[PDB]
mmCIF file of C-alpha atoms and ligand atoms in Angstrom:
data_model
loop_
_atom_site.group_PDB
_atom_site.id
_atom_site.type_symbol
_atom_site.label_atom_id
_atom_site.label_comp_id
_atom_site.label_asym_id
_atom_site.label_seq_id
_atom_site.Cartn_x
_atom_site.Cartn_y
_atom_site.Cartn_z
ATOM 1 C CA UNK A 1 12.065 -19.673 11.030
ATOM 2 C CA UNK A 2 9.188 -17.328 10.371
ATOM 3 C CA UNK A 3 6.485 -19.104 8.389
ATOM 4 C CA UNK A 4 4.953 -16.698 5.894
ATOM 5 C CA UNK A 5 1.766 -17.820 4.187
ATOM 6 C CA UNK A 6 1.274 -16.200 0.801
ATOM 7 C CA UNK A 7 -2.146 -16.462 -0.836
ATOM 8 C CA UNK A 8 -1.608 -16.693 -4.577
ATOM 9 C CA UNK A 9 -4.046 -16.610 -7.454
ATOM 10 C CA UNK A 10 -4.267 -16.440 -11.243
ATOM 11 C CA UNK A 11 -4.559 -13.274 -13.323
ATOM 12 C CA UNK A 12 -7.867 -12.597 -15.072
ATOM 13 C CA UNK A 13 -6.365 -10.149 -17.602
ATOM 14 C CA UNK A 14 -2.859 -11.454 -18.141
ATOM 15 C CA UNK A 15 -2.700 -14.688 -20.106
ATOM 16 C CA UNK A 16 -2.451 -17.971 -18.200
ATOM 17 C CA UNK A 17 -0.572 -19.251 -16.238
ATOM 18 C CA UNK A 18 0.410 -15.836 -14.899
ATOM 19 C CA UNK A 19 -0.151 -14.938 -11.234
ATOM 20 C CA UNK A 20 -2.409 -12.000 -10.454
ATOM 21 C CA UNK A 21 -0.562 -8.665 -10.418
ATOM 22 C CA UNK A 22 -1.533 -8.175 -6.796
ATOM 23 C CA UNK A 23 -0.289 -11.472 -5.375
ATOM 24 C CA UNK A 24 2.841 -11.381 -7.530
ATOM 25 C CA UNK A 25 3.660 -7.934 -6.216
ATOM 26 C CA UNK A 26 2.841 -9.082 -2.699
ATOM 27 C CA UNK A 27 5.090 -12.131 -3.045
ATOM 28 C CA UNK A 28 7.964 -10.194 -4.583
ATOM 29 C CA UNK A 29 7.742 -7.370 -2.082
ATOM 30 C CA UNK A 30 7.842 -9.878 0.761
ATOM 31 C CA UNK A 31 11.020 -11.431 -0.615
ATOM 32 C CA UNK A 32 12.627 -8.014 -1.272
ATOM 33 C CA UNK A 33 11.745 -6.229 1.917
ATOM 34 C CA UNK A 34 11.033 -8.935 4.513
ATOM 35 C CA UNK A 35 13.075 -11.993 3.584
ATOM 36 C CA UNK A 36 15.880 -9.864 2.056
ATOM 37 C CA UNK A 37 19.087 -11.889 1.985
ATOM 38 C CA UNK A 38 18.090 -13.706 5.229
ATOM 39 C CA UNK A 39 16.729 -16.666 3.377
ATOM 40 C CA UNK A 40 16.975 -19.203 6.187
ATOM 41 C CA UNK A 41 15.049 -16.974 8.627
ATOM 42 C CA UNK A 42 11.832 -17.413 6.610
ATOM 43 C CA UNK A 43 9.768 -20.204 5.116
ATOM 44 C CA UNK A 44 7.162 -19.396 2.498
ATOM 45 C CA UNK A 45 3.920 -21.303 2.487
ATOM 46 C CA UNK A 46 2.145 -20.782 -0.817
ATOM 47 C CA UNK A 47 -1.550 -21.391 -0.911
ATOM 48 C CA UNK A 48 -3.762 -21.248 -3.936
ATOM 49 C CA UNK A 49 -7.477 -21.787 -3.479
ATOM 50 C CA UNK A 50 -9.270 -23.184 -6.430
ATOM 51 C CA UNK A 51 -12.978 -22.742 -7.127
ATOM 52 C CA UNK A 52 -13.496 -37.284 -22.598
ATOM 53 C CA UNK A 53 -13.676 -38.340 -26.305
ATOM 54 C CA UNK A 54 -10.926 -37.628 -28.861
ATOM 55 C CA UNK A 55 -11.588 -37.727 -32.602
ATOM 56 C CA UNK A 56 -8.700 -35.810 -34.219
ATOM 57 C CA UNK A 57 -5.099 -34.657 -33.489
ATOM 58 C CA UNK A 58 -6.596 -31.190 -32.864
ATOM 59 C CA UNK A 59 -8.509 -32.469 -29.810
ATOM 60 C CA UNK A 60 -5.190 -33.411 -28.150
ATOM 61 C CA UNK A 61 -3.834 -29.885 -28.660
ATOM 62 C CA UNK A 62 -6.992 -28.404 -27.058
ATOM 63 C CA UNK A 63 -6.498 -30.694 -24.024
ATOM 64 C CA UNK A 64 -3.537 -24.015 -10.038
ATOM 65 C CA UNK A 65 -0.425 -26.159 -10.317
ATOM 66 C CA UNK A 66 1.391 -23.992 -12.840
ATOM 67 C CA UNK A 67 0.688 -21.038 -10.617
ATOM 68 C CA UNK A 68 2.316 -22.760 -7.620
ATOM 69 C CA UNK A 69 5.277 -23.717 -9.802
ATOM 70 C CA UNK A 70 5.914 -20.037 -10.667
ATOM 71 C CA UNK A 71 6.323 -19.159 -7.004
ATOM 72 C CA UNK A 72 8.214 -22.301 -6.056
ATOM 73 C CA UNK A 73 10.741 -21.435 -8.777
ATOM 74 C CA UNK A 74 11.049 -17.891 -7.410
ATOM 75 C CA UNK A 75 11.760 -19.301 -3.927
ATOM 76 C CA UNK A 76 14.216 -21.865 -5.219
ATOM 77 C CA UNK A 77 16.048 -19.196 -7.197
ATOM 78 C CA UNK A 78 16.923 -17.133 -4.132
ATOM 79 C CA UNK A 79 17.079 -20.183 -1.874
ATOM 80 C CA UNK A 80 14.120 -19.696 0.457
ATOM 81 C CA UNK A 81 12.434 -22.836 1.706
ATOM 82 C CA UNK A 82 8.842 -23.156 0.584
ATOM 83 C CA UNK A 83 5.850 -25.448 0.579
ATOM 84 C CA UNK A 84 3.044 -24.950 -1.876
ATOM 85 C CA UNK A 85 -0.363 -26.574 -2.225
ATOM 86 C CA UNK A 86 -3.911 -26.143 -3.356
ATOM 87 C CA UNK A 87 -7.128 -26.285 -1.392
ATOM 88 C CA UNK A 88 -10.674 -26.158 -2.729
ATOM 89 C CA UNK A 89 -13.623 -23.909 -1.886
ATOM 90 C CA UNK A 90 -14.383 -20.239 -1.297
ATOM 91 C CA UNK A 91 -10.944 -18.549 -1.361
ATOM 92 C CA UNK A 92 -11.465 -16.135 1.558
ATOM 93 C CA UNK A 93 -12.887 -18.813 3.832
ATOM 94 C CA UNK A 94 -10.297 -21.404 2.835
ATOM 95 C CA UNK A 95 -7.380 -19.034 3.389
ATOM 96 C CA UNK A 96 -8.719 -18.451 6.897
ATOM 97 C CA UNK A 97 -9.284 -22.195 7.435
ATOM 98 C CA UNK A 98 -5.707 -22.790 6.297
ATOM 99 C CA UNK A 99 -4.334 -20.165 8.671
ATOM 100 C CA UNK A 100 -5.895 -21.960 11.621
ATOM 101 C CA UNK A 101 -4.679 -25.350 10.345
ATOM 102 C CA UNK A 102 -1.115 -24.546 9.236
ATOM 103 C CA UNK A 103 -0.591 -21.755 11.813
ATOM 104 C CA UNK A 104 1.783 -19.605 9.787
ATOM 105 C CA UNK A 105 3.334 -16.666 11.638
ATOM 106 C CA UNK A 106 1.614 -14.347 9.212
ATOM 107 C CA UNK A 107 -0.413 -14.120 6.034
ATOM 108 C CA UNK A 108 0.493 -12.158 2.966
ATOM 109 C CA UNK A 109 -2.257 -11.199 0.571
ATOM 110 C CA UNK A 110 -2.169 -8.841 -2.323
ATOM 111 C CA UNK A 111 -5.011 -6.384 -2.595
ATOM 112 C CA UNK A 112 -6.675 -4.592 -5.444
ATOM 113 C CA UNK A 113 -7.730 -1.963 -2.902
ATOM 114 C CA UNK A 114 -11.405 -1.965 -3.840
ATOM 115 C CA UNK A 115 -12.817 0.340 -1.153
ATOM 116 C CA UNK A 116 -13.510 -9.343 -1.074
ATOM 117 C CA UNK A 117 -10.542 -11.622 -0.215
ATOM 118 C CA UNK A 118 -7.929 -9.325 1.323
ATOM 119 C CA UNK A 119 -10.507 -7.468 3.450
ATOM 120 C CA UNK A 120 -11.960 -10.684 4.780
ATOM 121 C CA UNK A 121 -8.509 -12.021 5.682
ATOM 122 C CA UNK A 122 -7.510 -8.919 7.634
ATOM 123 C CA UNK A 123 -10.813 -9.113 9.430
ATOM 124 C CA UNK A 124 -10.824 -12.824 10.204
ATOM 125 C CA UNK A 125 -7.448 -14.563 9.791
ATOM 126 C CA UNK A 126 -6.106 -15.864 13.132
ATOM 127 C CA UNK A 127 -2.631 -14.628 12.415
ATOM 128 C CA UNK A 128 -1.179 -11.204 11.545
ATOM 129 C CA UNK A 129 -1.936 -10.105 8.003
ATOM 130 C CA UNK A 130 0.256 -8.189 5.623
ATOM 131 C CA UNK A 131 -1.781 -6.518 2.899
ATOM 132 C CA UNK A 132 0.108 -5.368 -0.133
ATOM 133 C CA UNK A 133 -1.401 -3.198 -2.822
ATOM 134 C CA UNK A 134 -0.094 -2.932 -6.388
ATOM 135 C CA UNK A 135 2.280 -0.188 -7.525
ATOM 136 C CA UNK A 136 0.491 2.622 -9.385
ATOM 137 C CA UNK A 137 2.346 1.741 -12.624
ATOM 138 C CA UNK A 138 1.079 -1.856 -12.629
ATOM 139 C CA UNK A 139 -2.511 -1.116 -11.544
ATOM 140 C CA UNK A 140 -4.891 -1.741 -14.505
ATOM 141 C CA UNK A 141 -7.223 1.133 -15.463
ATOM 142 C CA UNK A 142 -10.029 -0.961 -13.962
ATOM 143 C CA UNK A 143 -8.836 -1.799 -10.418
ATOM 144 C CA UNK A 144 -11.042 -4.948 -10.288
ATOM 145 C CA UNK A 145 -8.884 -6.588 -12.951
ATOM 146 C CA UNK B 1 17.669 -1.933 5.225
ATOM 147 C CA UNK B 2 13.930 -2.319 5.379
ATOM 148 C CA UNK B 3 12.141 0.708 6.815
ATOM 149 C CA UNK B 4 9.399 -0.428 9.097
ATOM 150 C CA UNK B 5 6.983 2.330 10.182
ATOM 151 C CA UNK B 6 5.286 1.427 13.481
ATOM 152 C CA UNK B 7 2.291 3.459 14.545
ATOM 153 C CA UNK B 8 2.277 3.709 18.357
ATOM 154 C CA UNK B 9 -0.275 5.130 20.747
ATOM 155 C CA UNK B 10 -1.002 5.383 24.465
ATOM 156 C CA UNK B 11 -3.189 2.978 26.424
ATOM 157 C CA UNK B 12 -6.509 4.245 27.776
ATOM 158 C CA UNK B 13 -6.839 1.516 30.440
ATOM 159 C CA UNK B 14 -3.208 0.990 31.404
ATOM 160 C CA UNK B 15 -1.882 3.865 33.473
ATOM 161 C CA UNK B 16 0.222 6.456 31.679
ATOM 162 C CA UNK B 17 2.653 6.492 30.040
ATOM 163 C CA UNK B 18 2.071 2.916 28.845
ATOM 164 C CA UNK B 19 1.727 2.105 25.125
ATOM 165 C CA UNK B 20 -1.582 0.607 24.007
ATOM 166 C CA UNK B 21 -1.677 -3.182 24.308
ATOM 167 C CA UNK B 22 -2.188 -3.459 20.578
ATOM 168 C CA UNK B 23 0.701 -1.350 19.324
ATOM 169 C CA UNK B 24 2.942 -2.875 21.942
ATOM 170 C CA UNK B 25 2.022 -6.346 20.779
ATOM 171 C CA UNK B 26 2.431 -5.126 17.208
ATOM 172 C CA UNK B 27 5.925 -3.763 17.900
ATOM 173 C CA UNK B 28 7.127 -6.760 19.903
ATOM 174 C CA UNK B 29 5.782 -9.208 17.366
ATOM 175 C CA UNK B 30 7.549 -7.367 14.561
ATOM 176 C CA UNK B 31 10.864 -7.542 16.458
ATOM 177 C CA UNK B 32 10.394 -11.176 17.289
ATOM 178 C CA UNK B 33 9.093 -12.521 13.962
ATOM 179 C CA UNK B 34 10.347 -10.042 11.339
ATOM 180 C CA UNK B 35 13.518 -8.339 12.618
ATOM 181 C CA UNK B 36 14.626 -11.448 14.562
ATOM 182 C CA UNK B 37 18.409 -11.377 15.152
ATOM 183 C CA UNK B 38 18.883 -9.469 11.870
ATOM 184 C CA UNK B 39 18.910 -6.086 13.496
ATOM 185 C CA UNK B 40 20.894 -4.313 10.785
ATOM 186 C CA UNK B 41 18.498 -5.470 8.052
ATOM 187 C CA UNK B 42 15.669 -3.326 9.465
ATOM 188 C CA UNK B 43 15.140 0.252 10.617
ATOM 189 C CA UNK B 44 12.149 1.096 12.787
ATOM 190 C CA UNK B 45 10.324 4.384 12.215
ATOM 191 C CA UNK B 46 8.138 5.085 15.252
ATOM 192 C CA UNK B 47 5.278 7.455 14.692
ATOM 193 C CA UNK B 48 2.876 8.766 17.332
ATOM 194 C CA UNK B 49 -0.035 10.866 16.272
ATOM 195 C CA UNK B 50 -1.061 13.381 18.926
ATOM 196 C CA UNK B 51 -4.640 14.759 19.239
ATOM 197 C CA UNK B 52 0.380 28.629 28.871
ATOM 198 C CA UNK B 53 -0.337 30.012 32.337
ATOM 199 C CA UNK B 54 0.290 28.183 35.606
ATOM 200 C CA UNK B 55 -1.647 29.004 38.779
ATOM 201 C CA UNK B 56 -1.231 25.965 41.050
ATOM 202 C CA UNK B 57 1.107 22.995 41.653
ATOM 203 C CA UNK B 58 -1.638 20.890 40.078
ATOM 204 C CA UNK B 59 -1.245 22.729 36.741
ATOM 205 C CA UNK B 60 2.324 21.428 36.476
ATOM 206 C CA UNK B 61 1.241 17.861 37.060
ATOM 207 C CA UNK B 62 -1.329 18.261 34.277
ATOM 208 C CA UNK B 63 1.310 19.588 31.859
ATOM 209 C CA UNK B 64 3.439 16.584 32.624
ATOM 210 C CA UNK B 65 0.389 14.535 31.603
ATOM 211 C CA UNK B 66 -0.431 16.469 28.429
ATOM 212 C CA UNK B 67 -0.658 14.747 25.039
ATOM 213 C CA UNK B 68 2.753 16.155 24.122
ATOM 214 C CA UNK B 69 4.286 14.488 27.161
ATOM 215 C CA UNK B 70 2.174 11.335 26.792
ATOM 216 C CA UNK B 71 3.572 11.404 23.287
ATOM 217 C CA UNK B 72 7.275 11.714 24.100
ATOM 218 C CA UNK B 73 7.190 9.137 26.956
ATOM 219 C CA UNK B 74 5.589 6.796 24.508
ATOM 220 C CA UNK B 75 8.363 7.292 21.921
ATOM 221 C CA UNK B 76 11.010 6.870 24.585
ATOM 222 C CA UNK B 77 9.557 3.480 25.592
ATOM 223 C CA UNK B 78 9.940 2.121 22.040
ATOM 224 C CA UNK B 79 13.259 3.789 21.340
ATOM 225 C CA UNK B 80 14.632 2.077 24.446
ATOM 226 C CA UNK B 81 13.209 -1.225 23.186
ATOM 227 C CA UNK B 82 15.024 -0.711 19.872
ATOM 228 C CA UNK B 83 18.281 0.376 21.468
ATOM 229 C CA UNK B 84 18.271 -2.621 23.806
ATOM 230 C CA UNK B 85 18.392 -5.095 20.933
ATOM 231 C CA UNK B 86 20.456 -2.801 18.677
ATOM 232 C CA UNK B 87 17.876 -2.000 15.962
ATOM 233 C CA UNK B 88 18.248 1.479 14.434
ATOM 234 C CA UNK B 89 15.177 3.648 14.930
ATOM 235 C CA UNK B 90 13.721 7.073 14.386
ATOM 236 C CA UNK B 91 10.811 8.303 16.426
ATOM 237 C CA UNK B 92 8.693 11.405 16.119
ATOM 238 C CA UNK B 93 5.324 12.967 16.722
ATOM 239 C CA UNK B 94 2.871 14.472 14.264
ATOM 240 C CA UNK B 95 -0.388 16.213 15.124
ATOM 241 C CA UNK B 96 -3.925 15.736 13.775
ATOM 242 C CA UNK B 97 -6.292 12.862 13.054
ATOM 243 C CA UNK B 98 -4.237 9.671 13.644
ATOM 244 C CA UNK B 99 -5.477 7.614 10.654
ATOM 245 C CA UNK B 100 -5.130 10.553 8.219
ATOM 246 C CA UNK B 101 -1.696 11.500 9.583
ATOM 247 C CA UNK B 102 -0.347 7.946 9.528
ATOM 248 C CA UNK B 103 -1.274 7.855 5.843
ATOM 249 C CA UNK B 104 0.210 11.293 5.168
ATOM 250 C CA UNK B 105 3.373 10.156 6.918
ATOM 251 C CA UNK B 106 3.544 6.977 4.845
ATOM 252 C CA UNK B 107 3.610 9.015 1.677
ATOM 253 C CA UNK B 108 6.140 11.540 3.097
ATOM 254 C CA UNK B 109 8.588 9.123 4.715
ATOM 255 C CA UNK B 110 8.005 6.258 2.309
ATOM 256 C CA UNK B 111 8.656 3.311 4.638
ATOM 257 C CA UNK B 112 8.794 -0.114 3.088
ATOM 258 C CA UNK B 113 5.865 -1.074 5.273
ATOM 259 C CA UNK B 114 3.530 0.089 8.037
ATOM 260 C CA UNK B 115 2.870 -1.903 11.196
ATOM 261 C CA UNK B 116 -0.285 -1.123 13.141
ATOM 262 C CA UNK B 117 -1.800 -2.968 16.019
ATOM 263 C CA UNK B 118 -5.514 -3.660 15.816
ATOM 264 C CA UNK B 119 -8.206 -4.168 18.402
ATOM 265 C CA UNK B 120 -10.066 -6.142 15.747
ATOM 266 C CA UNK B 121 -13.261 -4.099 15.967
ATOM 267 C CA UNK B 122 -15.174 -5.647 13.023
ATOM 268 C CA UNK B 123 -11.092 2.988 13.160
ATOM 269 C CA UNK B 124 -7.300 3.368 12.687
ATOM 270 C CA UNK B 125 -5.923 0.013 11.494
ATOM 271 C CA UNK B 126 -8.724 -0.558 8.956
ATOM 272 C CA UNK B 127 -8.241 2.931 7.488
ATOM 273 C CA UNK B 128 -4.514 2.344 7.112
ATOM 274 C CA UNK B 129 -4.915 -1.042 5.381
ATOM 275 C CA UNK B 130 -7.356 0.539 2.985
ATOM 276 C CA UNK B 131 -5.478 3.773 2.316
ATOM 277 C CA UNK B 132 -1.775 3.658 3.173
ATOM 278 C CA UNK B 133 0.457 3.745 0.084
ATOM 279 C CA UNK B 134 2.717 1.008 1.356
ATOM 280 C CA UNK B 135 2.250 -2.586 2.626
ATOM 281 C CA UNK B 136 0.383 -2.740 5.907
ATOM 282 C CA UNK B 137 0.903 -5.370 8.560
ATOM 283 C CA UNK B 138 -1.995 -5.537 11.007
ATOM 284 C CA UNK B 139 -1.267 -7.400 14.241
ATOM 285 C CA UNK B 140 -4.023 -8.207 16.714
ATOM 286 C CA UNK B 141 -3.496 -8.818 20.411
ATOM 287 C CA UNK B 142 -3.113 -12.214 22.024
ATOM 288 C CA UNK B 143 -6.305 -13.603 23.514
ATOM 289 C CA UNK B 144 -4.774 -13.447 26.993
ATOM 290 C CA UNK B 145 -4.035 -9.714 26.833
ATOM 291 C CA UNK B 146 -7.274 -8.660 25.152
ATOM 292 C CA UNK B 147 -9.422 -6.740 27.677
ATOM 293 C CA UNK B 148 -12.960 -7.999 28.164
ATOM 294 C CA UNK B 149 -14.108 -4.946 26.207
ATOM 295 C CA UNK B 150 -12.060 -5.063 23.000
ATOM 296 C CA UNK B 151 -12.451 -1.296 22.463
ATOM 297 C CA UNK B 152 -10.188 -0.908 25.509
ATOM 298 C CA UNK B 153 -6.547 -0.609 24.656
HETATM 299 N N1 AMP C 201 -8.357 -17.949 -5.162
HETATM 300 C C1 AMP C 201 -7.411 -17.510 -4.345
HETATM 301 N N2 AMP C 201 -6.548 -18.349 -3.763
HETATM 302 C C2 AMP C 201 -5.600 -17.868 -2.949
HETATM 303 N N3 AMP C 201 -5.469 -16.560 -2.685
HETATM 304 C C3 AMP C 201 -6.320 -15.679 -3.237
HETATM 305 C C4 AMP C 201 -7.315 -16.143 -4.079
HETATM 306 N N4 AMP C 201 -8.017 -15.102 -4.496
HETATM 307 C C5 AMP C 201 -7.486 -14.023 -3.952
HETATM 308 N N5 AMP C 201 -6.458 -14.366 -3.177
HETATM 309 C C6 AMP C 201 -5.645 -13.396 -2.396
HETATM 310 O O1 AMP C 201 -6.390 -12.171 -2.373
HETATM 311 C C7 AMP C 201 -5.655 -11.137 -3.094
HETATM 312 C C8 AMP C 201 -6.627 -10.212 -3.749
HETATM 313 O O2 AMP C 201 -7.458 -9.645 -2.680
HETATM 314 P P1 AMP C 201 -8.775 -8.784 -2.966
HETATM 315 O O3 AMP C 201 -8.316 -7.789 -3.844
HETATM 316 O O4 AMP C 201 -9.298 -8.341 -1.747
HETATM 317 O O5 AMP C 201 -9.623 -9.747 -3.724
HETATM 318 C C9 AMP C 201 -4.735 -11.867 -4.036
HETATM 319 O O6 AMP C 201 -3.569 -11.068 -4.200
HETATM 320 C C10 AMP C 201 -4.392 -13.109 -3.199
HETATM 321 O O7 AMP C 201 -3.398 -12.838 -2.238
HETATM 322 N N1 AMP C 202 -2.496 8.198 17.833
HETATM 323 C C1 AMP C 202 -1.993 7.177 17.163
HETATM 324 N N2 AMP C 202 -0.789 7.305 16.619
HETATM 325 C C2 AMP C 202 -0.201 6.335 15.947
HETATM 326 N N3 AMP C 202 -0.798 5.165 15.771
HETATM 327 C C3 AMP C 202 -2.023 4.956 16.289
HETATM 328 C C4 AMP C 202 -2.666 5.961 17.015
HETATM 329 N N4 AMP C 202 -3.846 5.473 17.416
HETATM 330 C C5 AMP C 202 -3.957 4.220 16.941
HETATM 331 N N5 AMP C 202 -2.826 3.897 16.272
HETATM 332 C C6 AMP C 202 -2.502 2.629 15.590
HETATM 333 O O1 AMP C 202 -3.778 2.021 15.463
HETATM 334 C C7 AMP C 202 -3.756 0.762 16.218
HETATM 335 C C8 AMP C 202 -5.114 0.418 16.770
HETATM 336 O O2 AMP C 202 -5.918 0.126 15.649
HETATM 337 P P1 AMP C 202 -7.505 0.146 15.781
HETATM 338 O O3 AMP C 202 -7.737 -0.835 16.869
HETATM 339 O O4 AMP C 202 -7.896 -0.397 14.492
HETATM 340 O O5 AMP C 202 -7.906 1.477 16.085
HETATM 341 C C9 AMP C 202 -2.725 0.965 17.292
HETATM 342 O O6 AMP C 202 -2.215 -0.345 17.672
HETATM 343 C C10 AMP C 202 -1.676 1.767 16.538
HETATM 344 O O7 AMP C 202 -0.849 0.863 15.803
#
C-alpha cells in the first residue's frame, strides 16, 4: 500500500477551522487522480505542523486537531485508510524530519507558487514530492494568502 | 484514467540510447508506487524534448546517433516498458528548450500530473515544479545509482 504523506495547514483568509486552499486542493486532487477508486492501494498520512480565570458566562464562550479531523473525515468517506497527527516546530523542517521518520512513499504539499514550505520540501525531503498548485479560480488575488 | 505525463531524456554518461538515470528512476517508481497493478486506471504520456548530404559511411552512423534518433530510441524504451505491464501510453517528441517545452506541453495536453526525475542540484525539474500548470511529482535517484558527480545523468 503506497503511503502518501499529505502536509496540511490552516487557511489564513478563510475562517477557521478551514484547511488552506492549497493543501485542500492538493489533498483532493490526490484522492481524485492518484487514489481514484483504488482505495486499498493507498494510505494517507496527514501531518499538520503547529507553530486561566473565568468571571462570567461570556468567558466560557470565548474559550490543529479540527484541521486533521476535516481530512480524516474525507478519507473515511471514500474509505481510504489514514493516520493523522500533529508535530511542533518549523513546518518545513518538521515535514522533512517526519519524512525521514515515517518514510512515506511520497509527500504531497500544496503550493501557492510564490516564485517557503513547498520549495523547501522538494529540495530536501528524502522521498519523492508531489507539488500541487491551486486552480486559477480558487487562487486569491494575493497569491500569498 | 489518470493521465501521467513523464518527461524522459537521454543519459550523458550511460551509452546511447539509454534513458537518463533520473527519468528512468522516475518512470519506474511511478509504475511501482502509483500505477501498481491498476494499469487501466492510468495512462502514461511520454514526452522527450529534443535540442542532408552524406559523403562517407561515418555520416550514416552519425545520423543514427542524431538527437532525432536518440529521441525515438528513448521513446521506444519506455513504450516497451508500458506495453510489458499493459499500461496504455502515448509517446512523442517536441523540439526546443526542454523546461519551456515540457510546460508548453502540459498546458496543451493537460495531463493530470507531470513526473520528472531530478538530479537534486540545489535546471529542468525545478522549472517544472515552479511553472507547470498541473501537479508535479519530482523523483530523485536512489543513493546507489547516483553518480559521484550528481550533474551526471
Ligand atoms: N504548518 C504546516 N504544517 C503542515 N504542512 C504545511 C504547513 N505549512 C505549509 N504546509 C504545506 O505547504 C503548502 C504551502 O506551501 P508554500 O506555498 O510553499 O508555503 C501547504 O499546502 C501545505 O502542504
Ligand atoms: N530533454 C528532456 N525532455 C524531457 N524531459 C527532460 C529533458 N531533460 C530533462 N528532463 C526531465 O528533467 C529531469 C532532470 O531534472 P533536472 O535534474 O532537474 O534537470 C529528467 O529526469 C527528466 O524527467
